[PDB]
PDB file of C-alpha atoms in Angstrom:
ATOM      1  CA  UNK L   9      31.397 -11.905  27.590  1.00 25.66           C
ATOM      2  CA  UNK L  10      28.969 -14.565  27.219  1.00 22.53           C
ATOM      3  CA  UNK L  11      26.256 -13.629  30.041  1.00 19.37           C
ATOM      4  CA  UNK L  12      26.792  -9.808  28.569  1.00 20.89           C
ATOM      5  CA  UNK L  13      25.880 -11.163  25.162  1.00 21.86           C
ATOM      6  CA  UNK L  14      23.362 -12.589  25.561  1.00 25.68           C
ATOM      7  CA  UNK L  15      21.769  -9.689  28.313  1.00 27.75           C
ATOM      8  CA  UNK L  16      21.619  -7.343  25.306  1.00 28.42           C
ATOM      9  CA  UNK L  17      20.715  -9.726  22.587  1.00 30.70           C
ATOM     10  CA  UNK L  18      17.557 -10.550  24.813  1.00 29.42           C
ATOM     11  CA  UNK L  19      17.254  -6.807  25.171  1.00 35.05           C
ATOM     12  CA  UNK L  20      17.386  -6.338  21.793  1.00 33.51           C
ATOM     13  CA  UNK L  21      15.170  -8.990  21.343  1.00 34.11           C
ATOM     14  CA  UNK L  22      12.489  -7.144  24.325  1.00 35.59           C
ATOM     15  CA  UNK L  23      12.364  -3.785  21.900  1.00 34.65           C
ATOM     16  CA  UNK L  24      11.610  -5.654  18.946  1.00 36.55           C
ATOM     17  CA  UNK L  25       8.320  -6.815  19.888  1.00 34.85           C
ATOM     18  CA  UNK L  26       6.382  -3.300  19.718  1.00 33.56           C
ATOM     19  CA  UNK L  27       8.853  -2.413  16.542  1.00 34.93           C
ATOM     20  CA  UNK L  28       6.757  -5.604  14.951  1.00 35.44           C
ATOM     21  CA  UNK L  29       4.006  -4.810  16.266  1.00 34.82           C
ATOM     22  CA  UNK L  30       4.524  -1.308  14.644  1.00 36.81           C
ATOM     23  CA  UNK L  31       5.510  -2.196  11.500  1.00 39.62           C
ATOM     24  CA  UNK L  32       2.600  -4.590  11.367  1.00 41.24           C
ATOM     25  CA  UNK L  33       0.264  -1.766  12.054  1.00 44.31           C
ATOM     26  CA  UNK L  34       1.827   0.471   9.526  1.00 46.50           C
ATOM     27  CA  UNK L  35       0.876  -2.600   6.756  1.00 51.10           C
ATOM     28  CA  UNK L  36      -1.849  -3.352   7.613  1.00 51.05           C
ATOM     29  CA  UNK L  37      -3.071   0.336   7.138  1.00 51.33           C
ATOM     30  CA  UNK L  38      -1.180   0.551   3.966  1.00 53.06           C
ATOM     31  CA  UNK L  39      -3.391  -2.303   2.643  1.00 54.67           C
ATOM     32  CA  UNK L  40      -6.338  -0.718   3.230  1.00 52.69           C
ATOM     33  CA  UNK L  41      -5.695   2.844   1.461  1.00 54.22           C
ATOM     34  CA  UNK L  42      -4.164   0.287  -1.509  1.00 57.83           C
ATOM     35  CA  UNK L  43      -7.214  -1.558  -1.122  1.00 61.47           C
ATOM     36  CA  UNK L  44      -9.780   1.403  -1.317  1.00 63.46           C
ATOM     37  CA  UNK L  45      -7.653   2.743  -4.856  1.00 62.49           C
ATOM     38  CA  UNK L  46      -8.403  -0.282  -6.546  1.00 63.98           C
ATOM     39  CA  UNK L  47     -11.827   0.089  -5.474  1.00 65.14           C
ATOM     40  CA  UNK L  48     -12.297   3.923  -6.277  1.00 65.91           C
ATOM     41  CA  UNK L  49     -10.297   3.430  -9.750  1.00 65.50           C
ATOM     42  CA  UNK L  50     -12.940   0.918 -11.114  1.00 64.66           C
ATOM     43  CA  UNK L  51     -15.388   3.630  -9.594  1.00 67.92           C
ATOM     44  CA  UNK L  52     -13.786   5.997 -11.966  1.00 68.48           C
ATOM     45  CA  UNK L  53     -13.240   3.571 -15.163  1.00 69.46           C
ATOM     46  CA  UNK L  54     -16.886   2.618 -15.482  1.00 66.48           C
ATOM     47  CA  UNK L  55     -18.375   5.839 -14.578  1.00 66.40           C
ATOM     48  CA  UNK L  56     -16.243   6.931 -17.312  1.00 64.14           C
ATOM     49  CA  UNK L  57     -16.634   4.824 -19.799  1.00 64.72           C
ATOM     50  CA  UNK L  58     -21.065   5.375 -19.097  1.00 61.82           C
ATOM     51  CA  UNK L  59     -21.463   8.705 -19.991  1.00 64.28           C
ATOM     52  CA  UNK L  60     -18.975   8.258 -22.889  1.00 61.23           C
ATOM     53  CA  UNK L  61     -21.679   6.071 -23.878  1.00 66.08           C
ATOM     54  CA  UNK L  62     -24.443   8.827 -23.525  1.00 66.53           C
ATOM     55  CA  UNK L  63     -21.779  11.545 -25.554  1.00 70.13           C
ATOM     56  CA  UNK L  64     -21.443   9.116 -28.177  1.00 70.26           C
ATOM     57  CA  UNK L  65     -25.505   9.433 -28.415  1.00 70.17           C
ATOM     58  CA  UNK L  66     -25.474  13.016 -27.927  1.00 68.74           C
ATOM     59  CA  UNK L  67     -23.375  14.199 -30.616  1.00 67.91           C
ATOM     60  CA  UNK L  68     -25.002  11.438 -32.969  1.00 67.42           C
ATOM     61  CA  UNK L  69     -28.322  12.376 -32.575  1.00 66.00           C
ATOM     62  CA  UNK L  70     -27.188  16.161 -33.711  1.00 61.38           C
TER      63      UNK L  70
ATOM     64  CA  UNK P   6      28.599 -24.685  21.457  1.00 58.24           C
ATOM     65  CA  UNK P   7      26.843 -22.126  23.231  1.00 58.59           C
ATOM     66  CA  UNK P   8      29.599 -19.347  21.688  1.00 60.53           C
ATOM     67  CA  UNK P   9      28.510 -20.402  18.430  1.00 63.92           C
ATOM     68  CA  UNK P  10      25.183 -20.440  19.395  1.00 65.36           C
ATOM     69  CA  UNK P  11      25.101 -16.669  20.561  1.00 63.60           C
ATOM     70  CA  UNK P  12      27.458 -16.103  17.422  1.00 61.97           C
ATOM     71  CA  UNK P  13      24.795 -17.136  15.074  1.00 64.76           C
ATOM     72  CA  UNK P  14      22.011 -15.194  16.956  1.00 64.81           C
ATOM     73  CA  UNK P  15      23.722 -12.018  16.238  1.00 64.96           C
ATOM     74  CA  UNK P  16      24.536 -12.803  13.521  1.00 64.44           C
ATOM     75  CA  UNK P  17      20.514 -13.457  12.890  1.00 61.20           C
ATOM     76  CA  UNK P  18      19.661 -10.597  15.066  1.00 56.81           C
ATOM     77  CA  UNK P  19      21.132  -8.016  12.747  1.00 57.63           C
ATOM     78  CA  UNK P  20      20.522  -9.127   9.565  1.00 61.29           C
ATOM     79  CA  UNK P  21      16.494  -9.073  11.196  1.00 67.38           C
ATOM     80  CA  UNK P  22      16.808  -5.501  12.483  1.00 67.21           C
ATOM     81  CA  UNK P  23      17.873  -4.197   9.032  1.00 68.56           C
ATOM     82  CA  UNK P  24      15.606  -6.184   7.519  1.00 71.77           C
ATOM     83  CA  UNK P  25      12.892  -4.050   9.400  1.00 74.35           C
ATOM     84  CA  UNK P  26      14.270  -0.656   8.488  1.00 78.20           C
ATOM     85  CA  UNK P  27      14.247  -1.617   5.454  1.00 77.67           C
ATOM     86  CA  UNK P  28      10.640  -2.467   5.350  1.00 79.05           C
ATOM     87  CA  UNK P  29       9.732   0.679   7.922  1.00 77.88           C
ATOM     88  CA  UNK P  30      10.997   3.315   5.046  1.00 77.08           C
ATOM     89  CA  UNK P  31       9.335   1.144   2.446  1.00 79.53           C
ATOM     90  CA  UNK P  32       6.318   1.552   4.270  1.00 78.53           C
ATOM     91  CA  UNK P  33       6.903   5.324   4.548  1.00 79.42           C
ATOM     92  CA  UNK P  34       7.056   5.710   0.997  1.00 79.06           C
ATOM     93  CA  UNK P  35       4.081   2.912  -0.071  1.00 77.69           C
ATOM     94  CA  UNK P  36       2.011   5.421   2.177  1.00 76.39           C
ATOM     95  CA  UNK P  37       3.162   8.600   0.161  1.00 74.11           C
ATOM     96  CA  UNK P  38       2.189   6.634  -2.931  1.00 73.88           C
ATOM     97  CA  UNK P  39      -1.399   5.554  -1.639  1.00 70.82           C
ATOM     98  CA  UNK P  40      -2.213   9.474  -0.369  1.00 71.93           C
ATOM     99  CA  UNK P  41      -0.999  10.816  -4.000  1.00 70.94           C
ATOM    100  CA  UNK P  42      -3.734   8.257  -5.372  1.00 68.94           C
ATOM    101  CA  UNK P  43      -6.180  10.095  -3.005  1.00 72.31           C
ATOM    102  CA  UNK P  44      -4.804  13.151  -4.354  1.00 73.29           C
ATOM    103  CA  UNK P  45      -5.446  11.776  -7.705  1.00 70.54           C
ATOM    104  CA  UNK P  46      -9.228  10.880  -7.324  1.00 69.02           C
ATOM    105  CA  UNK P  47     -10.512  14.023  -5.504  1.00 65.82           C
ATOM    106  CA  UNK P  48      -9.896  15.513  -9.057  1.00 66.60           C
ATOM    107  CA  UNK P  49     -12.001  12.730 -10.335  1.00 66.50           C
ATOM    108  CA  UNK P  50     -14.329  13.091  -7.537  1.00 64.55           C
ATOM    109  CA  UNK P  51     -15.235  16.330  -9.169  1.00 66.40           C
ATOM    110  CA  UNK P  52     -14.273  16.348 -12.757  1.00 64.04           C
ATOM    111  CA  UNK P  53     -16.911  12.805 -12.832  1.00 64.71           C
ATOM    112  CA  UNK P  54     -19.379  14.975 -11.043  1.00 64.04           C
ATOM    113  CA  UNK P  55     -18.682  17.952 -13.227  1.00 65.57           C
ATOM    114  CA  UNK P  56     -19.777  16.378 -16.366  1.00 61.76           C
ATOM    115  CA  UNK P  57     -21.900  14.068 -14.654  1.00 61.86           C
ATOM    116  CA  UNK P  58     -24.802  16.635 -14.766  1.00 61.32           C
ATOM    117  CA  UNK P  59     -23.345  18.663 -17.604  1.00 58.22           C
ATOM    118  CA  UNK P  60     -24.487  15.950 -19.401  1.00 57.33           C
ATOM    119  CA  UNK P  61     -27.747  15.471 -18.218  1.00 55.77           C
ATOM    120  CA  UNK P  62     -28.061  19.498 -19.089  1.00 53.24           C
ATOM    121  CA  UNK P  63     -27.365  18.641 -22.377  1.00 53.29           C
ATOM    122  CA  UNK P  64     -29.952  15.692 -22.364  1.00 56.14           C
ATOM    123  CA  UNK P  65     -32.678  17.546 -21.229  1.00 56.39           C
ATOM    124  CA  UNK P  66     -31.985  20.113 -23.339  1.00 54.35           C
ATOM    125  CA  UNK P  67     -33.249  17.628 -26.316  1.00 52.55           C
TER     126      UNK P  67
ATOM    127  CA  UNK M  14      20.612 -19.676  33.145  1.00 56.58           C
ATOM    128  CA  UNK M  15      22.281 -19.590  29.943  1.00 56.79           C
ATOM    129  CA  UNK M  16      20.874 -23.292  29.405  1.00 56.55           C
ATOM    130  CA  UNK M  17      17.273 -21.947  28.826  1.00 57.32           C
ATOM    131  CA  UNK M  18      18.328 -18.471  28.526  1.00 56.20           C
ATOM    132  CA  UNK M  19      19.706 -19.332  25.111  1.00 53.49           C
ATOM    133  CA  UNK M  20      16.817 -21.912  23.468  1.00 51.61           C
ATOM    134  CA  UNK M  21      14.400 -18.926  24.498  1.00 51.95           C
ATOM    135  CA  UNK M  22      16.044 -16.109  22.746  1.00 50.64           C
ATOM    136  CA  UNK M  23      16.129 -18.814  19.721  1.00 52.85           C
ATOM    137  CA  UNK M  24      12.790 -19.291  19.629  1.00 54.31           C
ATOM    138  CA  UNK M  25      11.656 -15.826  20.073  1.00 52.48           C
ATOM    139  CA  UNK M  26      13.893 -14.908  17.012  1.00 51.12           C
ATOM    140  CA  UNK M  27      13.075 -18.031  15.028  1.00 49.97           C
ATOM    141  CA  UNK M  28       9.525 -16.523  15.768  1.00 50.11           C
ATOM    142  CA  UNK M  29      10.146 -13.015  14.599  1.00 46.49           C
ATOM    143  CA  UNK M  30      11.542 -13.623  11.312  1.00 44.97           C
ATOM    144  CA  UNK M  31       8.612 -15.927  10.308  1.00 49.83           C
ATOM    145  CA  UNK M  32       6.832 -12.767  11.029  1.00 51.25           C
ATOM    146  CA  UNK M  33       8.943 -10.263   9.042  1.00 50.40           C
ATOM    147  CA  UNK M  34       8.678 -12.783   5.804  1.00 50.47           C
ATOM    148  CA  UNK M  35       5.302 -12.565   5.568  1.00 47.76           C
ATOM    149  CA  UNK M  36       4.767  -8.918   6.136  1.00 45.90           C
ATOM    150  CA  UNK M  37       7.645  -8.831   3.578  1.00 48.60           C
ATOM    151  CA  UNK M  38       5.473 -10.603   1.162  1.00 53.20           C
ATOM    152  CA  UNK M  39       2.710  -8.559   1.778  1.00 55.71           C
ATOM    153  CA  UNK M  40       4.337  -4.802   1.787  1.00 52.54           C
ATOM    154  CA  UNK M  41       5.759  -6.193  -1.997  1.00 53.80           C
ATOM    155  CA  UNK M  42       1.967  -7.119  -2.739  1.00 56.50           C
ATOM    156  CA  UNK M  43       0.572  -3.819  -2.097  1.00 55.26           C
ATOM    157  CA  UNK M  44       3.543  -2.118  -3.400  1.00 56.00           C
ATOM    158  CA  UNK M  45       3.406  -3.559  -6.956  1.00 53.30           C
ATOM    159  CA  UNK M  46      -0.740  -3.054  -6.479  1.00 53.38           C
ATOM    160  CA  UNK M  47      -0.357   0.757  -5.672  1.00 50.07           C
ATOM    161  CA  UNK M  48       2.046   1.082  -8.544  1.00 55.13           C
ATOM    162  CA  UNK M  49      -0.450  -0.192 -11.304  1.00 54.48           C
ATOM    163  CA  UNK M  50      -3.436   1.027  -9.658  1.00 53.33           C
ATOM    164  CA  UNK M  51      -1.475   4.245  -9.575  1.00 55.93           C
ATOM    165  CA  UNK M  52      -0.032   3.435 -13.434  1.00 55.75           C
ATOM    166  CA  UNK M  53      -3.709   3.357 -14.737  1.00 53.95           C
ATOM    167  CA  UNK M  54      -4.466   6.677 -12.985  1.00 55.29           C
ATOM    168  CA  UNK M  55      -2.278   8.601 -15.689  1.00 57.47           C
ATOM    169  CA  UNK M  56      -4.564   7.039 -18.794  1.00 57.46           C
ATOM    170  CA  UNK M  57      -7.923   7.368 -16.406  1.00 61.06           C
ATOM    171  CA  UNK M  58      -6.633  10.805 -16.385  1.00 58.71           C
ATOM    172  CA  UNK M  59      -6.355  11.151 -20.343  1.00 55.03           C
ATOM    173  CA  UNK M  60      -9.303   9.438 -21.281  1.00 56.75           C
ATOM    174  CA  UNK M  61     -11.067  11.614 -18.808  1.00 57.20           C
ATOM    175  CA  UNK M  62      -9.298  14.551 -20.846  1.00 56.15           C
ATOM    176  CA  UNK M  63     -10.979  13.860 -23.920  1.00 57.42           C
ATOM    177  CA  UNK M  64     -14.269  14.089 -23.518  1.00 57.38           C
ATOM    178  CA  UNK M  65     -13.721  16.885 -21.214  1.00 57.84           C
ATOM    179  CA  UNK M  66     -13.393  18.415 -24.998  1.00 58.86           C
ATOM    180  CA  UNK M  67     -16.566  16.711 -26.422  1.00 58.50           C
ATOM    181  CA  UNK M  68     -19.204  18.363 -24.094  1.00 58.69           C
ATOM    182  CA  UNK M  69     -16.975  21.833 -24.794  1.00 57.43           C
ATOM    183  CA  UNK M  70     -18.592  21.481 -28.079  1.00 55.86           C
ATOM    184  CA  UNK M  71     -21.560  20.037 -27.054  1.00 57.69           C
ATOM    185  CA  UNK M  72     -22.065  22.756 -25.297  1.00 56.56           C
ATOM    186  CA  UNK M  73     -21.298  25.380 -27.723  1.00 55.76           C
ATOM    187  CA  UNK M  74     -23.615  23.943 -30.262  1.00 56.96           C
ATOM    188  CA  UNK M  75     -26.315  23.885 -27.938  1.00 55.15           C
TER     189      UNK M  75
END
């Protein structure tokens, strides 16, 4: 048993390091679309709130 | 000692490989999430541009 | 054999879950951060709604 238990627990343990080097990958590009979102949604929150400044002139000054 | 040794790898070994594709179809789906933000902005990306210049029609026009 | 065999495979384990428990951390990070920056899409998307309406008149005066 033994010698066969471990033979496939340290080929287990041989696939898992490209599955973590995978998975880290995967994050790591996950954190960058998150990351540009964040960026792109203040992009759209003051460019927004800007020209709601210039409307506000607009329809006061008619 | 060494039985219980291998018995608690295992042990750790599975509850670690779970543990992955668990994360892996998290990932899947936090991806999903961060390309339907994309899909959100693009509308932005125009609608901001839109009335970016719509406005500035409107200003020059007074 | 098994006398090494065995404190390697626990190290290289030991190793690997370190690892998953911080990429753990971080997919639950960007998760919850793509949820809110995804949250405050819906409201960027009804401010941007009305004055989509404004310049509609705006426009019709002018």
């Amino acid at each position: 048993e033994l010698l066969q238990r471990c033979e496939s627990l340290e080929k287990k343990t041989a696939t898992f390091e490209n599955i973590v080097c995978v998975l880290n990958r995967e994050v790591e590009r996950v954190a960058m679309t998150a990351e540009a979102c964040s960026r792109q949604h203040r992009l759209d929150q003051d460019k927004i709130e800007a020209l709601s400044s210039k409307v506000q002139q607009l329809e006061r000054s008619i």
